[PDB]
Ligand binder design. Structure first.
Ligand SMILES: C[As](C)(=O)[O-]
Ligand SMILES: [Pb+2]
Ligand SMILES: [Pb+2]
Ligand SMILES: [Pb+2]
Ligand SMILES: [Pb+2]
Ligand SMILES: [Pb+2]
Ligand SMILES: [Pb+2]
Length: 87
């Protein structure tokens, strides 16, 4: 019911940085693969691109912070809708 706050955005930027190791404002398939493997995953090279294209709104090949935030916003809107239904 509420849009992302400055503090939430700041926390999301830290999360973004966990993927974007070189801090160039993007998340590549390579960086994505590194994160997936750290969670017990092992997707394929081309399989990583599919996940990227799914979040990559401007279709430039990588994920930028705005698209990352958009996803987080959609997720929050989802949990908020459910938590308001659980009643
Ligand atoms: C969802 As509200 C805090 O604007 O009532
Ligand atoms: Pb409000
Ligand atoms: Pb505060
Ligand atoms: Pb923090
Ligand atoms: Pb990067
Ligand atoms: Pb963008
Ligand atoms: Pb992009």
């Amino acid at each position: 019911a509420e849009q992302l706050t400055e503090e939430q955005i700041a926390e999301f930027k830290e999360a973004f940085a966990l993927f974007d190791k070189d801090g160039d404002g993007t998340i590549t398939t390579k960086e994505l693969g590194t994160v997936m493997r750290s969670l017990g995953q092992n997707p394929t090279e081309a399989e990583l691109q599919d996940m990227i294209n799914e979040v990559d709104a401007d279709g430039n090949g990588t994920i930028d912070f705005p698209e990352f935030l958009s996803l987080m916003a959609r997720k929050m809107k989802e949990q908020d809708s459910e938590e308001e239904l659980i009643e």
